Amino acid sequence: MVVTRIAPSPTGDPHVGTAYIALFNYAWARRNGGRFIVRIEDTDRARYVPGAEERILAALKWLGLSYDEGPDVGGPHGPYRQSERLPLYQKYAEELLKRGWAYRAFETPEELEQIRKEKGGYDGRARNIPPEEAEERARRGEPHVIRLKVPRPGTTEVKDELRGVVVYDNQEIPDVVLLKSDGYPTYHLANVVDDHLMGVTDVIRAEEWLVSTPIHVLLYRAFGWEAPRFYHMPLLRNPDKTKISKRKSHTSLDWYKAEGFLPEALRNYLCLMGFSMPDGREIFTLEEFIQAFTWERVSLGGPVFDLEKLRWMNGKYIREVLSLEEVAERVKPFLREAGLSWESEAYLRRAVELMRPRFDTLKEFPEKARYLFTEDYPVSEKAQRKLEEGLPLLKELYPRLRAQEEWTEAALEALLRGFAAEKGVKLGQVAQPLRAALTGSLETPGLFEILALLGKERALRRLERALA
RNA sequence: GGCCCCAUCGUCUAGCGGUUAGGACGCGGCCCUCUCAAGGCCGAAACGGGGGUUCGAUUCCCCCUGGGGUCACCA
Ligand SMILES: Nc1ncnc2c1ncn2[C@@H]1O[C@H](COP(=O)(O)OP(=O)(O)OP(=O)(O)O)[C@@H](O)[C@H]1O
Ligand SMILES: N[C@H](CO)CCC(=O)O
Ligand SMILES: [Mg+2]
Ligand SMILES: [Mg+2]
Q: Is A373 helix (H, G, I), strand (E, B) or coil?
């Protein structure tokens, strides 16, 4: 069948590049009723960030993806954390030695740097070490690494399913280290070994790994194993077209969640990075994407991640995809974080409905509608101005208000339209100053609904401090 | 620089020899309207250059240019 995987390295915040690549592996596996695996690639203790693993795993779930095998879901080919598979790579690196496909190299990092300077890149000098001598030096405990012994001279063919075949000259492929002197494997060794043993048949990964594939094809040959299909996804870019990075763009999935972006929208946006629906539709579900996916509709240019379009899309989801109640629920954590509370679900729902078309992120809701949940709201200079200018006619409306029994949006509008008429003045001239009295702002939803919302007593109580 | 990949509006893109080169974000205008939004409508905006192949290139081939990626005891 079809087995795909995402192999995140726990060395920093959950990366948007990770979600993007994971998204396509998940779809390609589901499209073929296959398996989507999660393998944690923690082979470098130096860059290892404790707690990054749980974070990436939670972020993939948050985004909506589900995996069939992995660290916290089990599976027949675990462990799914490379740090727990060390004896394995060890066993295979040694197998390469016996097959004459690898060799031990004892140079210190300092000599290597010197060799890199003198000849630019390791020159494979350790190949001239007699195997028996290498062995003895290893048995004595002499620190060393195991390197890939590239067949020189020669040529190596790599086949990308989206680009075609690429023929490499073996002189462009280095005798890369497979096993480090601390006993850990390098990405090259572990990736091929683990993909084989886990049964992956479809490697979908970012284009940044394209040139490293020949190294992988050689390893698969060395082991006498069948290579999987390779599909390299174009890299996500910063506005300047360079591979998206932490300083030129927001790459942290935690930032997006913190900013109030809906996972559903972020996911939908990610789908448009390199792919497009047959009919041209832009808003669609994860499940629809899975079902319409095809490599034929994947474009290879490096897509610039447009934060602006994402906000737009996020707003689009909030008002057209999620239900009112779903939006009301998602907005709570942000209200809590803002230190605000709501009277009841009923109140909250109504508040969210009024503001629905006016915020593009969940975080903006407590900011633009703060006056709806606390008296501790700011008053803009322009609002304070409109209020002062309208104080006279507001004083004359107050009594009519406290006299109004039917406190409804229909009645209220009728009461005000009349007041503006009987006063020979445009509605806005009365509406705007009142709006500033109730909201401390001149940018809000409709006055009647805003007026109704709080109820007669509450409204007048606020209108009073403004006239006081 | 060597090697590799890529190339349609500013950005994400549709196109798979013949189209007024379409959509989306953003931008500008109009309508709606009690503000601000949302929404509707209109508009400005692209095939990097040069050769070919061909009756006919955005589309197929080649060169170059440009952009990106990679060349670690990191992934
Ligand atoms: N900027 C990016 N754009 C697109 N895909 C990316 C990007 N960065 C990583 N990926 C891909 O997403 C997956 C995430 O792998 P990983 O968690 O190790 O992220 P990473 O950025 O490569 O981390 P590291 O710093 O250790 O190299 C891989 O399949 C990788 O190819
Ligand atoms: N550990 C690597 C994370 O980038 C795996 C990349 C891949 O081969 O798909
Ligand atoms: Mg473009
Ligand atoms: Mg046009």
A: coil
